[PDB]
Amino acid sequence: RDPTQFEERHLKFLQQLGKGNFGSVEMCRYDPLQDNTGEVVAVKKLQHSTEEHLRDFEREIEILKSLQHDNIVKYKGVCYSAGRRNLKLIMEYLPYGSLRDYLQKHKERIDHIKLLQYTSQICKGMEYLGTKRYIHRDLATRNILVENENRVKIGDFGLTKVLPQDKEYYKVKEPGESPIFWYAPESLTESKFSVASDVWSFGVVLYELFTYIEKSKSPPAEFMRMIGNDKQGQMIVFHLIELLKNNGRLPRPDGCPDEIYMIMTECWNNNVNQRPSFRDLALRVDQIRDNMA
Numbered sequence: 001r002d003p004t005q006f007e008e009r010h011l012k013f014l015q016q017l018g019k020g021n022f023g024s025v026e027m028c029r030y031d032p033l034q035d036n037t038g039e040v041v042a043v044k045k046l047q048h049s050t051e052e053h054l055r056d057f058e059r060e061i062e063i064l065k066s067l068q069h070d071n072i073v074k075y076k077g078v079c080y081s082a083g084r085r086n087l088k089l090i091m092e093y094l095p096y097g098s099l100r101d102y103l104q105k106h107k108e109r110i111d112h113i114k115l116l117q118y119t120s121q122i123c124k125g126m127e128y129l130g131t132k133r134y135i136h137r138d139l140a141t142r143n144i145l146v147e148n149e150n151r152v153k154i155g156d157f158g159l160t161k162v163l164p165q166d167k168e169y170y171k172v173k174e175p176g177e178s179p180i181f182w183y184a185p186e187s188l189t190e191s192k193f194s195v196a197s198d199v200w201s202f203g204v205v206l207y208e209l210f211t212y213i214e215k216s217k218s219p220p221a222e223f224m225r226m227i228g229n230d231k232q233g234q235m236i237v238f239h240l241i242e243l244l245k246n247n248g249r250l251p252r253p254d255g256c257p258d259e260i261y262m263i264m265t266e267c268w269n270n271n272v273n274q275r276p277s278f279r280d281l282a283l284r285v286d287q288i289r290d291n292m293a
């Protein structure tokens, strides 16, 4: 038996782990003995599995299968349906859930030492991703998972793209739902995505962490306040571009160490080439952890 080949009729629904546009993730027991002793796994599937969606999903699956890192969720295998060949991605189950939910739950009971451990791990997962010339395009605390108190992993790759051989950016021609409040300026203006725009987004994740996911302080809430809550639809993007151009930025989170705030603001450079590298961010964060401890 090839253990990466999962028979769908043996997957028992336990609970839903998340849903949105395109897909959902469910906690399931893979229980071929049918006695409730099988392994519990995470199962990602498509809500709307059109030809185009399935094509993208299969690339996503290949991306995840190609990544082996302590801070990247583990690929376990796939399901194929008969006939139209619907696909399910089977992953390890990380029982503490998303980092967004975890931090929202425990708040300041997670101390700065812990937050920086998570930061370093996110940085390392991202640096590793970049070595494979993959661009994540969706880095947010909702996409990061908690294995245990001491380890987080990047948990979703639904928007991940491979760079063209001869280019250092990927251009999206027809944008779908876009997490615009995590986007670099050049992603908003030109739909250009690169390691450097992933670094911009990482700065936003660092902000999320240090606000402890306080809803009033969320990137959407803050940017909307800065451009005006009256702005709607496409005018949000117009005003956001103008704001960023003029160095409008998320504020320093309350109680945030200065060295950490400085990292955020460096990630949020309008000049793409001046943004730090993930290799350097991981070094810098580990040094800060070292100084604290």
Ligand SMILES: CC(C)(C)NS(=O)(=O)c1ccc(-c2ccc3[nH]nc(N)c3c2)cc1
Pocket: 017, 018, 019, 020, 021, 023, 024, 025, 042, 073, 091, 092, 093, 094, 095, 097, 098, 142, 143, 145, 155, 156, 158
């Ligand atoms: C991507 C999508 C639209 C489906 N929803 S989301 O972003 O809320 C999300 C992402 C990953 C997961 C996910 C993916 C793999 C997982 N392994 N163990 C987990 N707890 C776990 C969770 C769940 C929800």
